[PDB]
Amino acid sequence: GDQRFGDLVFRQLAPNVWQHTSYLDMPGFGAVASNGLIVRDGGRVLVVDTAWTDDQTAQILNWIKQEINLPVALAVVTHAHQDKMGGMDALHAAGIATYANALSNQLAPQEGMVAAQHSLTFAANGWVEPATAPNFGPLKVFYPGPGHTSDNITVGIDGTDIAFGGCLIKDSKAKSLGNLGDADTEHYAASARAFGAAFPKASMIVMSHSAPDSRAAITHTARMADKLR
């Protein structure tokens, strides 16, 4: 099922959806996997999240060329940390239109990231303002509230059973909530639950650091976050 392509791993999740995985050393603590998504929408490809680095992200584009062979119309990135935005320059070099939460773009320079070209803004109920996400096809972008970071956003794939929680959601057996350095611990539980409520049909939950899981990833993440309050 997993396809090794250089130093990256690709896994098909649905007829038009693949998960990309890349790795970065955290010195003294080992190699950390990060996952994003690749979606074919008719004659074009849409990407969710970069890899950790420009070189890895260019390799994602190379895999897309060889295994899908359609233009990448856009990429959306889900917060201003390296695992999700570290390859922005590679997307720009490839001519790909890039989108992030306005707050992610504001935070990008101080986080050592390059901002996306375009900023998403969100209604008070969390749904993206549609004019800021033109041509997103089946991608439905939702801001669930502050959690893993204040800017974290999430993405559902219409026409599939898949929703992507990024670094907000951990798997159903996870022992911790991971890196809380930029987290909002008071609001985390509610934000995890809001993600679940936004995508009630999503039975396959994709996330940044574990294989896809059932919706027990959402309940378990929220229950762990209850303890932070």
Ligand X SMILES: Cc1cc(C)c2c(CP(=O)(O)O)cc(=O)[nH]c2c1
Residues annotated as binding site?
A: 79, 81, 83, 148, 167, 170, 179, 209
Q: Which of 167, 192, 205, 206 binds Zn ion (CB under 5 A)?
A: 167
Q: Residue 66, Cβ neighbours under 10 Å: how many?
A: 9
CB of 32 to ligand X, least distance (A): 4
> For the window 62-101, what string marks contact with ligand X as x by the rule CB under 6 A?
-------------------xxx------------------
CB of 26 to ligand X, least distance (A): 5
Q: Which amino acid is at 74?
A: L
Q: Residue 221, Cβ neighbours under 10 Å: how many?
A: 30
Residues counted in the chain: 229
Subset of residues 135 to 174 that bind ligand X, contact rule: CB under 6 A: 167
Subset of residues 175 to 194 that bind ligand X, contact rule: CB under 6 A: 178-179, 181
CB of 178 to Zn ion, least distance (A): 6
CA distance 79 to 104: 6
Q: Write the DSSP symbol of residue 41.
A: E
Subset of residues 32 to 61 that bind ligand X, contact rule: CB under 6 A: 32
Torsions phi, psi of 55, nearest 5?
Answer: -60, -40
| Residue ranges at the known binding site for substrate | 170, 179
Check residue 81 for interaction with Zn ion (CB under 5 A): yes
Question: Which strand (E) or helix (H) includes residue 140?
Answer: strand 139-142
Question: b/e per residue, 108-147, with b = 16+ CB within 10 A?
Answer: beebebbbbbbebebeeebebeeebbeebbbbbbbbbbbb
Task: Give the interface with ligand X as residue ranges (CB under 6 A).
Answer: 26, 32, 81-83, 167, 178-179, 181, 208
Residues of this chain that bind Zn ion (CB under 5 A):
81, 167, 208
